[PDB]
Short mmCIF file of all heavy atoms in Angstrom, two decimals:
data_model
loop_
_atom_site.label_atom_id
_atom_site.label_comp_id
_atom_site.label_asym_id
_atom_site.label_seq_id
_atom_site.Cartn_x
_atom_site.Cartn_y
_atom_site.Cartn_z
N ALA L 1 87.61 90.50 103.65
CA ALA L 1 87.29 91.92 103.63
C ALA L 1 86.28 92.23 104.69
O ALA L 1 85.46 91.39 105.04
CB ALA L 1 86.75 92.33 102.28
N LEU L 2 86.30 93.47 105.15
CA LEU L 2 85.37 93.93 106.17
C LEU L 2 84.28 94.74 105.53
O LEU L 2 84.55 95.51 104.64
CB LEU L 2 86.12 94.80 107.16
CG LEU L 2 85.49 95.13 108.51
CD1 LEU L 2 85.39 93.86 109.36
CD2 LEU L 2 86.38 96.14 109.21
N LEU L 3 83.03 94.53 105.92
CA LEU L 3 81.94 95.30 105.38
C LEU L 3 81.91 96.58 106.24
O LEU L 3 81.69 96.51 107.45
CB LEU L 3 80.65 94.49 105.51
CG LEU L 3 80.59 93.13 104.81
CD1 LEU L 3 79.23 92.54 104.96
CD2 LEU L 3 80.88 93.30 103.37
N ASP L 4 82.19 97.74 105.65
CA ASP L 4 82.24 99.00 106.38
C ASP L 4 81.24 100.00 105.81
O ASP L 4 81.45 100.57 104.77
CB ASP L 4 83.67 99.57 106.31
CG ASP L 4 83.95 100.68 107.32
OD1 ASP L 4 83.04 101.41 107.73
OD2 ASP L 4 85.11 100.83 107.70
N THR L 5 80.16 100.25 106.54
CA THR L 5 79.12 101.18 106.10
C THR L 5 79.52 102.64 106.20
O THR L 5 78.86 103.52 105.66
CB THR L 5 77.85 100.95 106.92
OG1 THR L 5 78.16 101.10 108.31
CG2 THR L 5 77.36 99.56 106.69
N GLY L 6 80.57 102.92 106.96
CA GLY L 6 81.02 104.29 107.09
C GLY L 6 81.88 104.68 105.91
O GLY L 6 81.98 105.86 105.60
N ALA L 7 82.52 103.70 105.29
CA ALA L 7 83.40 103.90 104.14
C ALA L 7 82.62 104.12 102.85
O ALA L 7 81.82 103.26 102.47
CB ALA L 7 84.32 102.73 103.99
N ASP L 8 82.88 105.23 102.15
CA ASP L 8 82.20 105.53 100.88
C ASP L 8 82.66 104.62 99.76
O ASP L 8 81.86 104.17 98.94
CB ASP L 8 82.46 106.97 100.43
CG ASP L 8 81.91 107.99 101.37
OD1 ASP L 8 80.75 107.91 101.75
OD2 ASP L 8 82.63 108.93 101.70
N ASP L 9 83.97 104.46 99.66
CA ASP L 9 84.55 103.65 98.60
C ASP L 9 85.20 102.36 99.13
O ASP L 9 85.43 102.21 100.33
CB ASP L 9 85.59 104.49 97.85
CG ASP L 9 84.95 105.57 96.95
OD1 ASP L 9 84.45 105.18 95.82
OD2 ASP L 9 84.96 106.80 97.33
N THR L 10 85.50 101.46 98.21
CA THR L 10 86.14 100.21 98.58
C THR L 10 87.63 100.36 98.54
O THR L 10 88.21 100.66 97.50
CB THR L 10 85.67 99.09 97.66
OG1 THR L 10 84.28 98.89 97.89
CG2 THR L 10 86.37 97.81 97.96
N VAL L 11 88.28 100.14 99.67
CA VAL L 11 89.73 100.22 99.74
C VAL L 11 90.29 98.82 99.98
O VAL L 11 89.87 98.11 100.88
CB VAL L 11 90.21 101.16 100.87
CG1 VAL L 11 91.62 101.60 100.59
CG2 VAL L 11 89.29 102.36 101.04
N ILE L 12 91.27 98.44 99.16
CA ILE L 12 91.89 97.13 99.18
C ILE L 12 93.41 97.26 99.30
O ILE L 12 94.02 98.16 98.71
CB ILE L 12 91.62 96.44 97.84
CG1 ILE L 12 90.13 96.18 97.66
CG2 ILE L 12 92.40 95.18 97.71
CD1 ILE L 12 89.55 95.04 98.48
N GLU L 13 94.04 96.34 100.02
CA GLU L 13 95.49 96.34 100.16
C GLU L 13 96.12 96.17 98.78
O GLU L 13 95.49 95.68 97.86
CB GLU L 13 95.92 95.19 101.05
CG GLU L 13 95.70 93.84 100.39
CD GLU L 13 95.85 92.70 101.37
OE1 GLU L 13 96.16 92.96 102.55
OE2 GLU L 13 95.62 91.54 100.96
N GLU L 14 97.41 96.46 98.70
CA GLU L 14 98.17 96.44 97.45
C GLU L 14 98.13 95.15 96.63
O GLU L 14 98.27 94.04 97.17
CB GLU L 14 99.62 96.88 97.75
CG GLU L 14 100.56 96.95 96.54
CD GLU L 14 100.16 98.01 95.53
OE1 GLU L 14 100.16 99.23 95.87
OE2 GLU L 14 99.85 97.63 94.37
N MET L 15 97.95 95.30 95.31
CA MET L 15 97.93 94.16 94.41
C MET L 15 97.80 94.58 92.97
O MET L 15 97.54 95.75 92.67
CB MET L 15 96.80 93.18 94.74
CG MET L 15 95.41 93.60 94.32
SD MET L 15 94.27 92.27 94.66
CE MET L 15 94.04 91.58 93.03
N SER L 16 98.00 93.62 92.08
CA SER L 16 97.92 93.86 90.66
C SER L 16 96.51 93.75 90.15
O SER L 16 95.85 92.71 90.28
CB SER L 16 98.79 92.88 89.90
OG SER L 16 100.17 93.13 90.14
N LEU L 17 96.07 94.85 89.55
CA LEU L 17 94.76 94.96 88.95
C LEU L 17 95.01 95.47 87.54
O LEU L 17 96.07 96.05 87.27
CB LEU L 17 93.88 95.91 89.74
CG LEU L 17 93.55 95.23 91.06
CD1 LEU L 17 92.92 96.22 92.03
CD2 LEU L 17 92.63 94.05 90.78
N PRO L 18 94.07 95.22 86.63
CA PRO L 18 94.16 95.64 85.23
C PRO L 18 93.66 97.04 84.89
O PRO L 18 92.74 97.56 85.51
CB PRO L 18 93.33 94.57 84.52
CG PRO L 18 92.23 94.34 85.48
CD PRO L 18 92.96 94.26 86.80
N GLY L 19 94.29 97.61 83.86
CA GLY L 19 93.89 98.91 83.37
C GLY L 19 94.80 100.04 83.74
O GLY L 19 95.96 99.85 84.11
N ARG L 20 94.28 101.23 83.56
CA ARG L 20 94.99 102.45 83.88
C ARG L 20 94.32 102.96 85.14
O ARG L 20 93.16 102.67 85.39
CB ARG L 20 94.79 103.48 82.78
CG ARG L 20 95.48 103.16 81.51
CD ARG L 20 95.29 104.29 80.51
NE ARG L 20 95.83 105.58 80.94
CZ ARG L 20 97.13 105.84 81.09
NH1 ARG L 20 98.03 104.90 80.87
NH2 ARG L 20 97.53 107.07 81.36
N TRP L 21 95.05 103.75 85.92
CA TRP L 21 94.51 104.29 87.14
C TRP L 21 94.62 105.81 87.23
O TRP L 21 95.16 106.46 86.36
CB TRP L 21 95.18 103.64 88.35
CG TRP L 21 96.71 103.69 88.38
CD1 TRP L 21 97.57 102.77 87.85
CD2 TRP L 21 97.52 104.67 89.05
NE1 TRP L 21 98.86 103.11 88.16
CE2 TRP L 21 98.86 104.27 88.88
CE3 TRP L 21 97.25 105.83 89.77
CZ2 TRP L 21 99.92 105.00 89.42
CZ3 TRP L 21 98.29 106.55 90.30
CH2 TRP L 21 99.61 106.15 90.12
N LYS L 22 93.98 106.36 88.25
CA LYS L 22 94.00 107.78 88.54
C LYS L 22 94.44 107.85 89.99
O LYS L 22 94.34 106.85 90.71
CB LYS L 22 92.58 108.34 88.44
CG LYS L 22 91.89 108.05 87.10
N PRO L 23 94.98 108.99 90.43
CA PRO L 23 95.42 109.13 91.82
C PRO L 23 94.29 109.64 92.72
O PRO L 23 93.39 110.37 92.26
CB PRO L 23 96.55 110.13 91.71
CG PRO L 23 96.02 111.07 90.69
CD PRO L 23 95.41 110.16 89.64
N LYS L 24 94.32 109.25 93.99
CA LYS L 24 93.30 109.70 94.93
C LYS L 24 93.80 109.75 96.36
O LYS L 24 94.74 109.06 96.73
CB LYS L 24 92.05 108.82 94.84
CG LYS L 24 90.79 109.58 95.20
CD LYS L 24 89.57 108.72 95.24
CE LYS L 24 88.33 109.56 95.54
NZ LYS L 24 87.11 108.72 95.87
N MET L 25 93.20 110.62 97.15
CA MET L 25 93.56 110.76 98.55
C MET L 25 92.27 110.56 99.29
O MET L 25 91.26 111.13 98.90
CB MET L 25 94.07 112.15 98.83
CG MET L 25 95.48 112.39 98.32
SD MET L 25 96.42 113.34 99.57
CE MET L 25 97.30 112.03 100.42
N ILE L 26 92.25 109.68 100.28
CA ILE L 26 91.02 109.46 101.05
C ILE L 26 91.32 109.79 102.49
O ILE L 26 92.38 109.42 103.01
CB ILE L 26 90.56 108.00 101.01
CG1 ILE L 26 91.71 107.08 101.40
CG2 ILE L 26 89.97 107.67 99.65
CD1 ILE L 26 91.33 105.63 101.49
N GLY L 27 90.39 110.47 103.15
CA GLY L 27 90.61 110.80 104.54
C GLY L 27 90.18 109.72 105.51
O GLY L 27 89.01 109.34 105.51
N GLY L 28 91.12 109.23 106.31
CA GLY L 28 90.84 108.21 107.33
C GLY L 28 90.82 108.82 108.74
O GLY L 28 91.00 110.05 108.87
N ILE L 29 90.65 108.02 109.80
CA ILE L 29 90.63 108.61 111.14
C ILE L 29 91.96 109.22 111.48
O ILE L 29 92.01 110.36 111.95
CB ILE L 29 90.31 107.62 112.29
CG1 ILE L 29 91.11 106.34 112.11
CG2 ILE L 29 88.81 107.43 112.46
CD1 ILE L 29 91.11 105.45 113.35
N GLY L 30 93.03 108.48 111.21
CA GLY L 30 94.37 108.95 111.53
C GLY L 30 95.04 109.86 110.52
O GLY L 30 96.22 110.17 110.67
N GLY L 31 94.32 110.29 109.50
CA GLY L 31 94.93 111.16 108.52
C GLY L 31 94.52 110.74 107.12
O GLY L 31 93.53 110.05 106.97
N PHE L 32 95.28 111.18 106.12
CA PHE L 32 94.99 110.84 104.72
C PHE L 32 96.02 109.89 104.18
O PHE L 32 97.12 109.80 104.73
CB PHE L 32 95.02 112.11 103.85
CG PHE L 32 93.96 113.12 104.19
CD1 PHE L 32 94.16 114.05 105.20
CD2 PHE L 32 92.76 113.15 103.49
CE1 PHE L 32 93.17 115.00 105.50
CE2 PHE L 32 91.75 114.10 103.79
CZ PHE L 32 91.96 115.02 104.79
N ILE L 33 95.66 109.16 103.13
CA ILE L 33 96.60 108.25 102.47
C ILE L 33 96.34 108.42 100.99
O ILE L 33 95.27 108.87 100.60
CB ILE L 33 96.40 106.76 102.79
CG1 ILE L 33 94.97 106.35 102.47
CG2 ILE L 33 96.79 106.46 104.20
CD1 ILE L 33 94.75 104.88 102.52
N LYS L 34 97.32 108.02 100.18
CA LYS L 34 97.27 108.10 98.72
C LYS L 34 96.90 106.73 98.15
O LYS L 34 97.48 105.71 98.56
CB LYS L 34 98.63 108.53 98.15
CG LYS L 34 99.12 109.91 98.57
CD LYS L 34 100.56 110.17 98.09
CE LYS L 34 100.95 111.68 98.22
NZ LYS L 34 102.39 112.02 97.87
N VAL L 35 96.01 106.72 97.17
CA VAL L 35 95.56 105.47 96.59
C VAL L 35 95.45 105.51 95.07
O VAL L 35 95.37 106.58 94.45
CB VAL L 35 94.20 105.06 97.19
CG1 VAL L 35 94.28 104.95 98.71
CG2 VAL L 35 93.15 106.06 96.81
N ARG L 36 95.46 104.33 94.46
CA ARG L 36 95.33 104.22 93.02
C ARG L 36 93.91 103.74 92.74
O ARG L 36 93.51 102.71 93.24
CB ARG L 36 96.33 103.20 92.50
CG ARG L 36 97.73 103.37 93.04
CD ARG L 36 98.76 102.75 92.11
NE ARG L 36 98.39 101.40 91.70
CZ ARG L 36 98.63 100.30 92.43
NH1 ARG L 36 99.26 100.38 93.60
NH2 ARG L 36 98.21 99.10 92.00
N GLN L 37 93.16 104.49 91.94
CA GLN L 37 91.79 104.15 91.62
C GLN L 37 91.64 103.39 90.31
O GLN L 37 92.03 103.89 89.27
CB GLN L 37 90.98 105.43 91.59
CG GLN L 37 89.63 105.32 90.92
CD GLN L 37 88.83 106.61 90.95
OE1 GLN L 37 89.13 107.54 91.69
NE2 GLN L 37 87.82 106.68 90.11
#
């Protein structure tokens, strides 16, 4: 993982994590993407 001080939240590539999630959109340099929180 890269330590990014400009990034507010931690974004990780796709994988299985436990629990229920909520939907989110985060704005990147090249646009926005959809993520599971």
Side-chain angles (χ1 to χ4, degrees), residues 1-21 23-37:
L2 195 67
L3 301 184
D4 195 332
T5 57
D8 296 310
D9 288 282
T10 295
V11 200
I12 296 285
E13 69 192 358
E14 182 65 63
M15 76 175 258
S16 292
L17 290 169
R20 290 184 61 67
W21 54 270
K24 209 185 183 192
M25 285 221 97
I26 52 176
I29 45 167
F32 296 85
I33 55 170
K34 297 173 167 175
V35 303
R36 313 203 312 276
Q37 164 178 345

